[PDB]
Amino acid sequence: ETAAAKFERQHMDSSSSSNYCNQMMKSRNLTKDRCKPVNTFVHESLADVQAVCSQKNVACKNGQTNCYQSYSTMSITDCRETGSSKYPNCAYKTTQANKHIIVACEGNPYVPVHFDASV
């Protein structure tokens, strides 16, 4: 699995409910080795998200310079692990929102490889 493929698996859902995160985090294998604390799914088309790599260049949280912020807000779902959540039964809080996304891009083709933040 490539870095680009991994990004699509972990963050893309172009296809809501209170149990969305509980179902999605498991189906996308984000709770295999451990309960991933937080994760975000983007409901926009792959083309629209891949297009962010040519948008607003901004600094990455880690200090690298290959991050890009979307010019338009995007429909996203933030997943956050609850306190009562215990592996292997990872429980998540599903929250829908419309915000600008920031992703790190790499390669040729230059595509998203890391979801940095939502603003």
Curated annotation (Swiss-Prot):
EC number, UniProt record: 4.6.1.18
Highest taxon in the source lineage: Eukaryota
Glycan-linked positions: 6, 29, 32, 36
GO molecular function: lyase activity; nucleic acid binding; ribonuclease A activity; RNA nuclease activity
Annotated catalytic residues: 11 (proton acceptor), 114 (proton donor)
Cellular component, GO, one term: extracellular region
Assigned keywords, A-Z: Disulfide bond, Endonuclease, Glycation, Glycoprotein, Hydrolase, Lyase, Nuclease, Secreted, Signal
Binding site for substrate: 6, 9, 36-40, 61, 80
Disulfide bonds: 21-79, 35-90, 53-105, 60-67
One GO term of the biological process aspect: defense response to Gram-positive bacterium
Compartment annotation: Secreted
Catalytic reaction annotation: an [RNA] containing cytidine + H2O = an [RNA]-3'-cytidine-3'-phosphate + a 5'-hydroxy-ribonucleotide-3'-[RNA]; an [RNA] containing uridine + H2O = an [RNA]-3'-uridine-3'-phosphate + a 5'-hydroxy-ribonucleotide-3'-[RNA]
Tissue: Pancreas.
Family classification: Belongs to the pancreatic ribonuclease family.
Function: Endonuclease that catalyzes the cleavage of RNA on the 3' side of pyrimidine nucleotides. Acts on single-stranded and double-stranded RNA.
Subunit structure: Interacts with and forms tight 1:1 complexes with RNH1. Dimerization of two such complexes may occur. Interaction with RNH1 inhibits this protein. Monomer.
Protein name: Ribonuclease pancreatic
Species for this entry: Bos taurus (Bovine)
